[PDB]
A and B are shown apart, each in its own frame.
With several copies, the nearest count.
Chain A
C-alpha cells in the first residue's frame, strides 16, 4: 500500500464489455485512486471496496510493443497497451506475429519514402511496429524459402483494412526498383470494385460485402511482374433485399443520379424512390458523400481501365434492366386447381424487354412458367406467386454476379500481364486478402450466418498457425511441450457445415421440402442439434431465434428471412431467354450458361451452396501459402482524430480471436 502507484481498479459497471481500467493513486485517505481513470474520471474509493484495487505490474505500467511479454496477460492489459500508444500517435502494435493497427482518422506522417528504406530488410522487432514490417518480412521470407506467402487483413468495417492493403502494396512497389505502373492501376481498380462490391450498412457508410484478393505475382529476383484480382464470398442477397437502415450497392445510386438526363431517358430511369430494390431500406441518401462525385470517379477509373464508352452503356442498361424487373408486380391466380401468376402491366416490363432486347412475350412466359424439356417433349408448368418472385430475384442476382465477374475479368486483363509459365519457377506470389470480420448485430440474418461461418474457417486457420509457432515451435528448440495441450476447435464447424445433419444442409433441405417454412426449419435444427452444447435452442415454441456458440460467443440468428434469401432458382428457360437475346453483352456474360444442355438445374446452387464452394476455393488458396495476420481496430464510432472508446475496442478484441494467442501462453510458459 503506497501512494501514486498504478493499480488495476475494477469498476462493477453492468456493461457487457467491461474490464479493469487501473488508475494512478492520489491523496491518502481510503482508496482514493482517482487522478483520472485514464481520461478524467474520479473514484472516491472506500476501504471496504479496496478489493477492487490490484497492484499493477511494471511491464503493464509502460506500454510494450510485444503484448506476448506483457506482465498482466488479460484483456484489460491488452486494451490499455493500445491506449497509451494511441494517445501518443502510435497506431501499431505486435502480439507475437499479429500486427494490431488502430485507424487514426487523421493523416499522420509515419508513412514516407524514408520510412520505406528505413524499414527495408528489417526483421520483426528490429524496429517499432509498422505495416511495412509485415510486408518486408513477407517479401524476405518469400525468396528466402522459395514459398508463396499470404497476408490476411481483417477487422471491423471502417477500421482501415483497405488502406492497409494500399500501404503494403506501396511498400512492395518501392522494394522493386521500377515504379511499376501496375500499382497505379490497382489503385484505379479500387473505386470501380468498391462501387460494385460495397454497400451502406447500419454500422458504416462504406462496408465491404465480399472478399478481395490481390495476387501480385513476383518475377524471379524482382517484383510486380503481374497482379491478378480475384473476388470471393460476394453477398448476392442484398441485390434484391435490403435490411432496414441499409441500402443496395452504391452503383445503382451513383448511376441513377449524376447522369445526363437524356441518358436516363434512353434507359427509362427516373428517381430512386420509385424502385423497390433501392427504396425498401428507407434510406436513399447517405450523409457524408455526394454519390454524383463518385459517378465521375467511377467513370474516370473505368476510362483508365480500358473501359470504352460502349462498355459502360452496356453495363448501364443491364443495371437499368435490373431496376425495372425489380418493380414488376405479381398477382396470384388459381388456374385450374393449381397455382398461377399474372405480371401486372407496367412501363417497367416493356422497358426491361427493350433493355434486355428480348421479345416481350418471351419475357412474360419465362417469368411465369417452367418447361421440363424431357426427352421427346417439352411440357410447360405454371409457377406459384412465391416461385415467380424467386425466379425474378434469381435472374436479377444472376446478372449482377456475372456482371461483377466480367468487371473483375476486364480489370484483370489490363493488369495481369500473364507471367511466362514455360519456366517451372513460374513466380513467387504474395497474396493480399481483404476480408470482412465477425459481427454480432442486434438482428442477425442469413447474411450474418454465412459471414460468421467464414470467420470460423479463418479463425481455425489462424489458430493452427499460431499453435504451430507457439510451444510447437519456440519450445521445440529447447523446452518440452508435448505435455502442453494444443486442442483445436472444430466442433462448431462440424455442426455448421462439416458433418452430416449440419446446419447449412438443414436450411437447404427445408428450402425445397414441400410446405417448407422458417418455423419448420427451426424445428429441424432444434430436433437434430438440441443435445449439442454449441447449439442454443429457443426457450419457447414462439421464439424464432436459434443460438450458435461461435468462437467469439453465442450469436442468435433470426429464423425469419431464411428460406427466402437462400433460394437462387435459375430454370433452363432463363438461360434460353438470354441465349436468344439480341444484346451481345448479356450473352457474353452468360457464355458458360448459354452452352446449356443440363437438367441439373434442380440443384441450381443456392446461396448457401455457392458460398461454401467459394469459401473452400478461398481456403485452398490460403492453405498453399504461409500466412501473415493483421488486425485493424476502429477506436471510435464518430470519426475523430483522437478518441479511444474502450467498450467499442474491447468488443473488437474479443471478436477478433486474438485472445486465443494469449490463452495458449497461459497454458504454456507465460
Chain B
C-alpha cells in the first residue's frame, strides 16, 4: 500500500538518489568506478576489483577513475550497472523489486540509451514500475512554476527547454555538450601556464576542486583582464593534498568564461546567453514576454558567483529594452532536478503513467518511446 517511490537522478558527474517525498536527496556521491592500476604485494589484504562512489575517492591514488556517463550518454553498460547496484543496495538500503523507480535524462539523446535503461531496470533489478523524465521539466516543478525557460547545466550537457502553462515547445529545445567536465579540462590545460601540471585522473579531481572553490564568472571580461594584469588582488591560494601551495590569478574567471565564449575550447557554438535568447525567439510571439520574465537556472555549473548577473546583462542586451529580464537562480538549484522529480513522483495523477512490468513484457523495450514523452 504505502510503497514509497524512488527518484534516481543519475547524472554524468554526480548521482542523486532518494525517496519520493523527501526534501533533499538521501545519497549524493560521484559517478565514478575505479580499478587498481598497481601491484598488490601484501598477501591477505582485502582484494576488491572495483570501487564505486565515495569509496573510490578515498583510495584515489591507487586507482584509475572512469566515468560511465559522458555528455549524458551511457558509454559503459557494466560500470553503470555497478553504480546502480551501489545506489540501490549500499546507499539506499532498499530492495529494487518493491519500489517503483523514476529516472532522468537529457532532452536529445539516442533512443538506445532509453531502451537499454528500460531493459536493465526491468530485467536485472526487476523494478515493479519505471518512468523516464526530462530533467529540465523537473526543474520547473522544483521552482514551483508552470511557465518559463529553464537553463540546466551539469557536467555532461547544457540544455534549454521553454515551457508555457505546462506545454513544451519541442522545436525550441537546444542542447550543448559544453559543461562542467569541459570546464575542468580547460582549467587543467590553462594551469600549465603557471607551471602546475595535472595529468592523472586523480589529479583531475583536484583540478575540479580548485575550480569549484576558486572560480567565478566575471561581469566584464576585458576589465577583469585589466585588473588581473595590473594587480594581484584577484589572486588566491589553494593547498594541494601533499602540502604544496598553488596560486591562480586570471584563470579563476578565464575558466568559467568558456560558457559565454565556447571558442576557447575550440567549439563553434554560441554562448549560453545566445542559446537561451534563440530558444526564446523560436517560441511564439506572445509567450516571449513570460519566458523573459522567468529564466530558471539549474545544475552545478550554474553555481559560479556572478553567473546570474552576467546572464541578466547579456539577455538584457540581446532582448528588447521594454521587456523585463529576470534570472531565477534558487539557492538550492544544484538539487532542483531531484526535488522536482520527487514532487512529480509524489502526485496522484502520475500513478497511472508508470510503465508496469506487464506492459514491458507485452511490448518490449520500445514501450518507453510511446509512454515516456
Contact = CB atoms under 8 A, between A and B. Distances in A.
Interface of A: 336-338, 372-376, 379-382, 500-501, 505-506, 508-509, 512-515, 520, 523-524, 527, 539-542, 571-572, 599-603
B47 A338 contact: no
B24 interface: yes
Contacts of A374: 24-25, 28, 335
Contacts of A506: 348
A338 B330 contact: yes
A379 B140 contact: no
Given A509-B347, A515-B146, 17 more contacts: A338-B328, A372-B24, A374-B25, A374-B335, A379-B331, A379-B332, A379-B335, A381-B330, A382-B331, A500-B352, A513-B44, A520-B46, A527-B46, A599-B23, A600-B19, A600-B21, A602-B22
Nearest to A520: B46
A501 B21 CA distance: 18
Given A372-B335, A374-B28, A601-B23, A509 B90 contact: no
B23 A337 contact: no
A601 to B, nearest CB: 6
A601 B24 CA distance: 10
A603 B349 CA distance: 17
A599 B335 CA distance: 14
B89 interface: yes
Contacts of A523: 46
Given A514-B146, A599-B22, A500 B348 contact: yes
B171 interface: no
Given A374-B28, A542-B90, A500 B331 contact: no
A378 to B, nearest CB: 10
Given A514-B141, A600-B22, A372 B348 contact: no
Given A372-B332, A376-B28, A541 B327 contact: no
Contacts of B370: none
Given A509-B44, A515-B144, A337 B331 contact: no
Interface of B: 18-19, 21-28, 44, 46-47, 89-90, 93, 140-141, 143-146, 308, 326-332, 334-335, 342-343, 346-349, 351-352
Nearest to B20: A602
A599 B23 CA distance: 5
Contacts of B332: 372, 379, 381
Contacts of A512: 343, 346
A336 B22 CA distance: 26
Contacts of A382: 331
Nearest to A505: B348
Nearest to B338: A374
Nearest to B343: A512
B89 A540 contact: yes
B55 to A, nearest CB: 9
Contacts of A376: 28
Nearest to A543: B93
Contacts, number: 90
6 contacts: A382-B331, A505-B348, A506-B348, A508-B348, A540-B89, A599-B18
A375 B334 CA distance: 13
Nearest to A500: B351
Given A514-B140, A520-B46, A540 B93 contact: yes
B161 to A, nearest CB: 15
A281 B140 CA distance: 39
Contact of A602 (B47, B335, B342): B342
B89 A514 contact: no
5 closest residue pairs by CB, A with B:
A374-B24, A514-B144, A505-B348, A372-B24, A599-B22
Contacts of A527: 46-47
B90 A572 contact: no
A523 B49 CA distance: 13
Contact of A514 (B90, B145, B331): B145
A602 B352 CA distance: 22
Contact of B331 (A381, A515, A524, A571): A381
B359 to A, nearest CB: 17
Nearest to A374: B24
A599 B24 contact: yes
Nearest to B94: A540
B8 to A, nearest CB: 15
Nearest to B24: A374
A501 to B, nearest CB: 7
A520 B146 CA distance: 13
Contact of A524 (B25, B46, B329, B330): B46
B144 A337 contact: no
Contacts of A513: 44, 347
A196 B106 CA distance: 55
A542 B348 contact: no
B146 A602 contact: no
Contacts of B26: 375, 599
Contacts of A501: 348-349
Nearest to A387: B144
Contacts of A372: 23-24, 332, 335
A601 B25 CA distance: 12
Contact of A373 (B24, B89, B346): B24
A500 B347 CA distance: 12
Contacts of B28: 374-376
A158 B353 CA distance: 49
Nearest to B16: A374
A473 B254 CA distance: 72
